[PDB]
RNA sequence: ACAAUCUUCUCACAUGAGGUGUUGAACGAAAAUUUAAAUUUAGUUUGAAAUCGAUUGGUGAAAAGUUUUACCACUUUGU
């Protein structure tokens, strides 16, 4: 029992043990490997704005299932996480990298139809990091 | 009224009662020896137009009689920007 | 003119009177009435726009008809619960001889024929409490001291004295809302300073 | 006299204008008060205060 | 057996969770072991509660009804300082997740979607015995009329043993919020919950009811019934003598 | 001549009938004054209908009141046309409401002298009442 | 004067009794009950949100049968 947060890069290369939960919390940078690299259960964080994924999928005869949340049970500590980031220094000072990491990866996708970062909202992504506003990241 | 009624919790301790503050924790240490973040309102042209710019300010007062009007003309605009 | 806050405030003041008689009421029939006296000074210190009508009749009768008015009150049981009553109101405690002395002393008025009449003489309490033989200033100081006999009737001639909160300093007369810093309760001996602040 | 055309701040920014990194003054307890309290201490043990 | 010298007891329970078993009738991400909460109803030959009392009853009993894993919040008397180190040195972190001190209660939680918020954000919410008659304000209708009353654990002394024993204590026994009502309903236990269990954790409430509830006792029990959210009310007993019972009662 | 109809809501707790009559009376007299309140319990629903001798006097207190912060509340007073309103929005206005205490009622109709008539037309029907419930077992 | 008294624990012998205090609106299940409307009551949504929908049993306190209470509730409106 446990959990390990690990890049796909960091992960390729490596052999997966007998896991429970595989989850793709950002999109993968290489889909053509990802296709492939799948092969206890599988599951993918999407926001409604990179559908094309689905299609892409679709094209690559990849099955697939929908998973759906309830808004209500959803942990409402936005606020307290705010107020976490924004006190520690170096909670803070790592939000700000791996927003801006996590911006210029985006940005370098090689799918640009399907992760467009001009499609992203750059408000709600700092919200998941923690900001009430965006910081001021160069790209 | 209103505005000022939650201002007025904020105020900015005195003189006096700064130098009251740093005072009794100056006894301490001379005898021998952590606190919390201050809470106030911030104040000053270049201080306040620096917050506003770096979205760090919730509520912008500007007063409406500033005598070289120039120094606040810009103000309503760049808040309205922010 | 009348500002909609004040009106809301007075509702909120209102409520909070009507929750704090219905607590000192309900289940509370208990006081800790004071014990090693038998006299206690009673001054009105604060008052409501639109009292409920309970605390405006007990204030009539404990004679607390206007505010700085003060009274000398027999302790016992009847006078300490309605005293419980109007608490938030008074601000009461155990008056010395000192205390005594002076005020009747310096702003003991009676009551003659039912006008307000300064004691500035004995031939008029003579004429007035012959009966119960009571001739002086200093009899009528006894009697209120000792809780004596003719204590009732005394205390029915004088009329209640006016403790007027006093701003000689001039931050006290700048200030608003100045009453002395005139806390209510029970005050024990402090109120003797309180007194000797005014007479 | 035409009116006021706001061409440029109709529209809100949404990050903040300076991308300098926050220094580490504004997270702990303020040098400028510990400098002064370390300067009263001294002329509390000599006397002066 | 007090019911009425006999005691109908364990085949209508044992009956109604095989029941409950025999009507079973997008995929979902957030799951939880939730299920459907046994509920026992009362009849009395009259009012309970001369008027609502916002306290619930601690009726001890040795199945809980809180599942364990229920995040609890913890409403101390100032300073909350002592209590969070106290929590910390009971080692009661994974249970007692937060410690709020009346007064940071009273003033950081003041709108009613900050109530919300909070309310949603635990489970369970434990409060000290001296600061429970204060709780009716500070926690509105959004606290003690959705479904979620405050618990009357008694931690005065302040040590870590009697900490884990009154928490213990509070997971252990349900609780009932007496009302003004010639009916009420009480949770004895869950569909996964055991006939022989919700058996006892019935005759246990019942008891309990009849001791500091119902203050004529047994005989001022009109009927019982058990019931979960969409079942019939089963009965299990009624008053053999109520006849003659509201005759000399009325 | 047309008398006007404001309507106010947000009301603070506080801003009860009496407060806001004699707070709007200093706008202007005042005729018909509701506040709307549940009916169970009898509390208020923090919104009001005040009916001024005029619509212009009505038109100033909206353009008065509308937005006023008040004990953190913005106040909302819109003036309603004749229009939309209607015939017995003030049913029961400058009238005190009855807070009915419905549960006290409740006990002393469950607890009252009866007689033996009456006591067996309550407990009458005590063996089907299981037999409605035996049919569904 | 947008300020005020919603209790940071009691009493009795580790034990019992007590603490009378909750915004409104909307959705909603099926139950115990009592004398068609009334009491409890699962589970949810919400900026202290609002545009007719008021129900009407009983208790008395002051002015003069009458009008005035805007939590007068059965310990029932002024010791």
Redesign the pocket.
């Known amino acids: 029992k446990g959990i390990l947060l690990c890049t796909n890069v960091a992960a390729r290369g490596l052999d997966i043990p007998a896991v429970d939960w595989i989850v793709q919390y950002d999109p993968p940078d290489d889909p053509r490997d990802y296709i492939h690299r799948v092969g206890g259960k599988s599951l993918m964080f999407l926001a409604p704005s990179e559908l094309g994924f689905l299609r892409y999928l679709k094209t690559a005869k990849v099955s697939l299932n929908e998973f759906e949340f309830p808004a209500?049970k959803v942990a409402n500590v936005q606020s307290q996480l705010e107020k976490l980031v924004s006190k520690n220094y170096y909670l803070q000072q790592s939000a700000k990298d791996g927003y801006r990491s996590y911006l210029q990866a985006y940005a370098s996708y090689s799918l640009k139809s399907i992760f467009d970062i001009n499609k992203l909202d750059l408000a709600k992504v700092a919200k998941s990091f923690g900001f009430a506003h965006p910081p001021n990241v160069n790209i | 009224?209103?505005v000022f009624?939650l201002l007025n919790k904020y105020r900015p301790e005195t003189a006096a009662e700064k130098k009251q503050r740093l005072v009794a924790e100056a006894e301490a240490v001379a005898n021998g020896k952590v606190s919390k973040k201050p809470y106030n309102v911030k104040y000053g042209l270049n201080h306040v137009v620096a917050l506003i710019e770096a979205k760090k300010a919730k509520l912008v007062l500007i007063a409406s009689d500033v005598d070289p009007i120039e120094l606040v003309v810009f103000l309503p605009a760049l808040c309205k920007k922010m | 003119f009348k500002?909609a806050?004040?009106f809301?405030?007075?509702?909120?003041?209102?409520?909070?009177?009507?929750?704090?008689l219905?607590?000192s009421?309900?289940?509370?029939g208990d006081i800790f009435v004071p014990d090693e006296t038998k006299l206690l000074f009673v001054i009105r210190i604060?008052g409501?726009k639109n009292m409920?009508?309970?605390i405006?009749?007990?204030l009539?009768?404990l004679r607390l008809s206007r505010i700085n008015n003060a009274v000398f009150v027999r302790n016992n049981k009847?006078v300490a619960?309605?005293l419980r009553?109007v608490?938030?109101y008074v601000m009461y405690g155990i008056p010395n001889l000192h205390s005594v002395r002076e005020l009747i002393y310096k702003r003991g008025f009676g009551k003659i024929n039912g006008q307000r009449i300064a004691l500035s003489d004995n031939a008029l309490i003579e004429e007035a409490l012959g009966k119960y033989d009571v001739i002086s200033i200093e009899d009528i100081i006894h009697e209120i001291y000792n809780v004596g006999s003719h204590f009732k009737e005394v205390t029915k001639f004088l009329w209640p004295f006016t403790l007027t909160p006093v701003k000689h300093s001039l931050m006290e007369k700048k200030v608003?809302?100045f009453?002395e810093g005139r806390k209510?309760?029970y005050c024990g001996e402090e109120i003797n300073e309180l007194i000797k602040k005014q007479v | 006299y035409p009116d006021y055309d706001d061409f440029f701040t109709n529209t809100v920014r949404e990050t903040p204008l300076s991308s300098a990194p926050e220094p580490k003054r504004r997270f702990a307890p303020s040098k400028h008060e510990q400098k002064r309290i370390l300067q009263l201490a001294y002329a509390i043990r000599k006397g002066r205060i | 057996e007090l019911l009425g010298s006999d005691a109908p007891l364990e085949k209508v329970c044992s009956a109604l969770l095989e029941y409950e078993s025999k009507r079973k009738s997008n995929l979902l991400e957030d799951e939880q072991d939730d299920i459907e909460?046994v509920?026992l109803?009362?009849?009395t030959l009259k009012?309970i509660?001369?008027?609502?009392?916002?306290?619930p009853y601690k009726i001890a009993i040795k199945n809980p009804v809180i599942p364990s894993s229920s995040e609890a919040c913890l409403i101390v008397?100032?300073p909350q300082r002592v209590y969070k180190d106290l929590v910390n040195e009971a080692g009661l972190s994974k249970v007692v997740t937060r410690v709020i001190?009346?007064?940071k209660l009273?003033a950081k939680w003041?709108?009613?979607?900050?109530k919300?918020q909070l309310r949603?954000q635990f489970d369970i919410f434990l409060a000290d015995?001296?600061?429970?008659?204060?709780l009716?304000?500070i926690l509105?209708?959004?606290f003690?009329?959705?479904?979620k009353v405050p618990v009357?654990v008694?931690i005065?002394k302040g040590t870590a043993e009697?900490l884990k024993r009154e928490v213990v204590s509070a997971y252990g026994a349900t609780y009932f919020?007496s009302?003004?009502?010639?009916?009420?309903?009480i949770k004895c236990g869950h569909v996964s919950n055991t006939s022989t269990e919700l058996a006892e954790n019935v005759e246990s409430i019942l008891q309990f009811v009849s001791?500091?509830i119902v203050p004529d006792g047994a005989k001022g029990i009109?009927?019982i019934?058990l019931?979960t959210?969409?079942?019939?009310?089963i009965?299990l007993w009624?008053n053999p003598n109520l006849k003659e019972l509201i005759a000399s009662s009325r | 001549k047309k008398k006007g109809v404001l309507?106010v809501?947000?009301?603070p707790?506080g801003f009860?009938?009496?407060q806001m009559?004699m707070y709007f009376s200093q706008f202007g007299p005042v005729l018909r004054?509701?506040?709307?309140?549940?009916?169970?319990?009898?509390?208020?629903?923090?919104?009001a209908?005040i009916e001024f001798e005029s619509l212009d006097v009505a038109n100033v207190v909206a353009e008065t009141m509308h937005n006023y912060?008040?004990?953190?509340?913005?106040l909302?007073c819109?003036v309603?046309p004749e229009d939309?309103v209607?015939?017995?929005?003030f049913?029961?206005a400058?009238?005190?409401?009855?807070?009915?205490?419905?549960?006290?009622?409740?006990?002393?109709?469950?607890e009252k002298p009866?007689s033996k008539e009456?006591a067996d037309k309550?407990i009458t029907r005590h063996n089907r009442?299981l037999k409605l419930?035996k049919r569904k077992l």
């Open positions: 209500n | 009224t209103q009624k | 500002r806050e004040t809301i405030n007075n509702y909120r003041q209102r409520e909070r009177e009507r929750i704090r219905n607590r009421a309900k289940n509370k604060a409501v409920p009508p309970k405006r009749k007990v009539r009768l009847a619960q309605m009553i608490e938030p608003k809302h009453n209510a309760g | 909460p509920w109803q009362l009849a009012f509660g001369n008027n609502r009392k916002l306290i008397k100032d001190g009346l007064s009273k003041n709108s009613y979607e900050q919300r949603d015995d001296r600061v429970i008659p204060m009716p304000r509105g209708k959004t003690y009329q959705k479904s009357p008694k005065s009697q919020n009302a003004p009502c010639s009916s009420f309903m001791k500091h009109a009927s019934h019931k959210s969409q079942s019939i009310a009965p009624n | 309507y809501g947000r009301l707790h009860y009938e009496k009559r004054l509701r506040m709307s309140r549940n009916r169970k319990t009898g509390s208020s629903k923090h919104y209908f912060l008040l004990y953190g509340k913005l909302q819109k309603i939309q209607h015939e017995n929005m049913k029961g400058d009238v005190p409401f009855k807070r009915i205490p419905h549960a006290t009622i409740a006990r002393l109709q469950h009866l009456k309550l009442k419930k």
